Curated annotation (Swiss-Prot):
InterPro entries listed in its UniProt record: Glutathione_peroxidase, GPX_AS, GPX_CS, Thioredoxin-like_sf
Record lineage: Eukaryota, Metazoa, Spiralia, Lophotrochozoa, Platyhelminthes
Origin: domain of life: Eukaryota
UniProt-recorded name of the protein: Glutathione peroxidase
UniProt keyword terms in alphabetical order: Oxidoreductase, Peroxidase, Selenocysteine
Family membership: Belongs to the glutathione peroxidase family.
Gene: GPX1
UniProt record, GO biological process: response to oxidative stress
Catalytic residues as annotated in Swiss-Prot or TrEMBL: C37
GO molecular-function term, one example from the UniProt record: glutathione peroxidase activity
This enzyme's EC code(s): 1.11.1.9
Catalytic activity: 2 glutathione + H2O2 = glutathione disulfide + 2 H2O
Induction: Activity increases significantly as worms mature in their host and is positively correlated to the resistance to antioxidants.
């Protein structure tokens, strides 16, 4: 019966559980991440630039580490946090590691995938897929891993302009 992302609670990268009610009224870009992928640098760099450009306008970027793709997120949370903060200066919201596929996927990802279908098949295909969520907590677009974060900015602006 879940009707929006606000129904879910997740553990942040510091081990602090937070309800996604926190994000009511903001546009969210939800990204599954990994530190040991060939596109790690470009995704984190562009996400941090987009955070800096758009956080004041209502964008919230949420990054969920996940080790389901090629064993590319093997580290624990403290090490992930240190890596991304020291290398990229990440200021957006980082979470504890989850699964995005299978029956043990976080309910947030079960929900996201139930709202926006992937290309051909529905499982998350690799690290750095993106879901765009409007100011009412509705997932309204999904982008494949190879989509540069910058190419999502136009769609973000449309949703930021809405009430
Ligand atoms: Li499928």
């Amino acid at each position: 019966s879940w009707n929006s992302i606000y129904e879910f609670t997740v553990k942040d990268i510091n081990g602090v559980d937070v309800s996604l009610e926190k994000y009511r009224g903001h546009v969210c870009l939800i990204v599954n991440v990994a530190c040991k992928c060939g596109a790690t640098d470009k995704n984190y760099r562009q996400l941090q630039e987009m955070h800096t450009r758009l956080v004041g306008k209502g964008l919230r970027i949420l990054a969920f580490p996940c080790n389901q793709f090629g064993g590319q997120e093997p580290w624990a949370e403290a090490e992930i946090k240190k890596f991304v903060t020291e290398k990229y200066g990440v200021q957006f919201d980082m979470f504890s590691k989850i699964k995005v596929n299978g029956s043990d996927a976080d309910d947030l990802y079960k929900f996201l995938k139930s709202r926006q279908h992937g290309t051909l098949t529905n499982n998350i295909k690799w690290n750095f897929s993106k879901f765009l969520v409007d100011r009412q907590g509705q997932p309204v677009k999904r982008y494949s891993p190879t989509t540069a974060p910058y190419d999502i900015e136009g769609d973000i602006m449309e949703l930021l302009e809405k009430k």
